[PDB]
Amino acid sequence: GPHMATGQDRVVALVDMDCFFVQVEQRQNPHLRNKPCAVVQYKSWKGGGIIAVSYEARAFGVTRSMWADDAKKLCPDLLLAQVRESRGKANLTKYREASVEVMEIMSRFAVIERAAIDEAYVDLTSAVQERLQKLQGQPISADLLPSTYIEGLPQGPEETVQKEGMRKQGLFQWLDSLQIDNLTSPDLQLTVGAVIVEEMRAAIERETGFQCSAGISHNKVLAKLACGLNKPNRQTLVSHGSVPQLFSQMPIRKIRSLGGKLGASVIEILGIEYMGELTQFTESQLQSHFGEKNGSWLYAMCRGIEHDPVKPRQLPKTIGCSKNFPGKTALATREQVQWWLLQLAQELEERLTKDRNDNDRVATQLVVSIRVQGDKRLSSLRRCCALTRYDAHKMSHDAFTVIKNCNTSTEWSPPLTMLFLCATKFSAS
DNA sequence: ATTTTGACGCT
DNA sequence: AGCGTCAA
Numbered sequence: 001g002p003h004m005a006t007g008q009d010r011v012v013a014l015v016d017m018d019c020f021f022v023q024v025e026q027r028q029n030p031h032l033r034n035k036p037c038a039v040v041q042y043k044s045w046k047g048g049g050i051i052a053v054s055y056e057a058r059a060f061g062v063t064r065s066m067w068a069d070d071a072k073k074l075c076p077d078l079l080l081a082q083v084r085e086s087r088g089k090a091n092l093t094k095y096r097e098a099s100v101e102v103m104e105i106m107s108r109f110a111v112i113e114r115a116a117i118d119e120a121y122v123d124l125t126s127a128v129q130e131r132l133q134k135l136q137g138q139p140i141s142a143d144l145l146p147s148t149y150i151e152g153l154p155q156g157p158e159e160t161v162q163k164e165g166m167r168k169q170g171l172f173q174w175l176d177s178l179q180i181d182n183l184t185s186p187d188l189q190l191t192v193g194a195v196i197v198e199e200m201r202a203a204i205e206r207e208t209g210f211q212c213s214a215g216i217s218h219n220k221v222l223a224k225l226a227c228g229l230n231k232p233n234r235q236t237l238v239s240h241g242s243v244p245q246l247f248s249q250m251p252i253r254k255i256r257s258l259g260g261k262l263g264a265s266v267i268e269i270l271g272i273e274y275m276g277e278l279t280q281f282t283e284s285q286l287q288s289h290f291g292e293k294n295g296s297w298l299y300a301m302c303r304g305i306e307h308d309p310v311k312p313r314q315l316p317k318t319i320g321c322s323k324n325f326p327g328k329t330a331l332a333t334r335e336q337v338q339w340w341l342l343q344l345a346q347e348l349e350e351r352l353t354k355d356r357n358d359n360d361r362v363a364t365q366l367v368v369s370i371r372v373q374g375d376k377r378l379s380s381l382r383r384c385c386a387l388t389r390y391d392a393h394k395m396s397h398d399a400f401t402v403i404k405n406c407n408t409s410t411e412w413s414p415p416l417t418m419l420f421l422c423a424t425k426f427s428a429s
Numbered sequence: 430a431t432t433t434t435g436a437c438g439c440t
Numbered sequence: 441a442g443c444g445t446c447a448a
């Protein structure tokens with residue numbers, strides 16, 4: 001009753017760029033704008049692998065991971081932009097730099113947690129408190145929320161036939177119901193959060209040209225889920241009260257962290273399909289099947305409650321470079337292995353030197369990882385060494401030294417299907 | 430031959 | 441420390 005926490009203490013947003021790498025390339029090349037477009041890496045093997053797809057191309061069925069030759073079978077007029085290749089490998093610098101543009105804009109509004117190259121969480125609790133104080137009892141106009149959806153609305157009792165009509169009808173129902181007079185109202189706090197996110201998204205688009213979607217809720221899992229509900233170029237508010245109906249038909253795998261083996265086990269062991277069905281288990285039952293940590297997390301999450309903080313971290317914690325060597329291209333000679341370690345180490349050196357100048361820090365550990373032909377696991381072996389000098393020849397030599405005894409017997413066997421260098425354990429400089 | 434990353438958990 | 445999970 002009066003003591004049941006409801007996980008309504010925070011306002012959290014997740015901002016995710018729409019078809020991000022495609023938009024970077026469309027900004028650079030106006031010929032690609034408003035077209036079915038994709039970004040591809042490599043070209044010789046089946047036209048290259050698609051890693052990003054414009055919404056116009058998705059309408060034809062083009063997806064991430066498709067070979068470009070096959071995408072062309074679905075979408076003959078598909079336009080393609082190629083990832084830069086340097087030193088024999090795909091080089092993602094352009095997208096990392098565009099990411100920095102967006103992150104630097106978002107951080108003007110609030111503390112952000114960089115969650116991936118194109119998305120960040122925002123803890124808006126303090127900003128909402130401030131805006132509620134400058135704005136005192138003044139109602140919030142629908143004009144302040146021109147691209148916001150209220151999940152679950154409209155409900156109940158003809159513009160309803162088109163999607164913008166429905167959006168406005170749901171928003172009107174929501175705002176009509178709001179009580180602006182209580183500064184402690186969670187629903188009001190979320191609404192002010194959404195106003196701020198509209199401002200943030202407008203700033204991102206104005207200052208970079210890039211469009212994005214966003215979720216606004218009380219925690220990161222719900223913000224992330226909300227964000228995906230009305231992509232692209234829209235934002236979605238998931239209130240605490242919307243959770244029971246939303247979760248009643250939500251496949252377990254759609255919640256972040258449950259998309260893999262753990263989610264599959266939740267489905268298989270409990271014989272359920274949707275997140276809401278989890279409410280019928282005690283915390284102890286869930287802990288018994290999935291462990292203390294997972295059990296408690298699931299017990300709270302299925303009720304819309306999660307406490308994971310927005311971490312104050314705008315910069316990546318590691319800087320890595322990897323290359324796969326599939327099928328017949330697997331590395332089978334000592335010289336091959338050393339040459340590719342050098343290529344990787346040279347890209348890594350460039351990125352580390354820039355990072356040291358920009359961010360006043362230095363990496364102190366080098367992690368070397370390899371995969372052997374036949375092993376399905378991403379990494380077959382991982383070994384570390386000291387990272388004491390930003391020198392590509394030294395880093396590549398040290399990596400060879402730490403992995404050379406994996407070679408069973410001038411020849412390398414079994415052939416290597418992946419090399420990976422990662423700089424870790426940063427200290428201030 | 431789904432590539433190139435990145436964060437965090439378990440022991 | 442080294443491996444495993446999940447993710448974009």
Ligand SMILES: Nc1ncnc2c1ncn2[C@H]1C[C@H](O)[C@@H](COP(=O)(O)NP(=O)(O)OP(=O)(O)O)O1
Pocket residue numbers: 016017018019020021022051052053064117118231232432433448
């Ligand atoms: N498996 C993968 N491998 C390589 N790059 C990937 C990737 N998944 C994503 N990327 C890269 C390429 C992507 O552009 C970028 C962001 O990933 P998203 O946010 O998952 N997808 P996007 O922004 O394209 O579309 P929208 O969000 O509107 O659905 O990260």
Ligand SMILES: [Mg+2]
Pocket residue numbers: 016017018019020118
């Ligand atoms: Mg995105």
Ligand SMILES: [Mg+2]
Pocket residue numbers: 016017116118119448
């Ligand atoms: Mg994303």
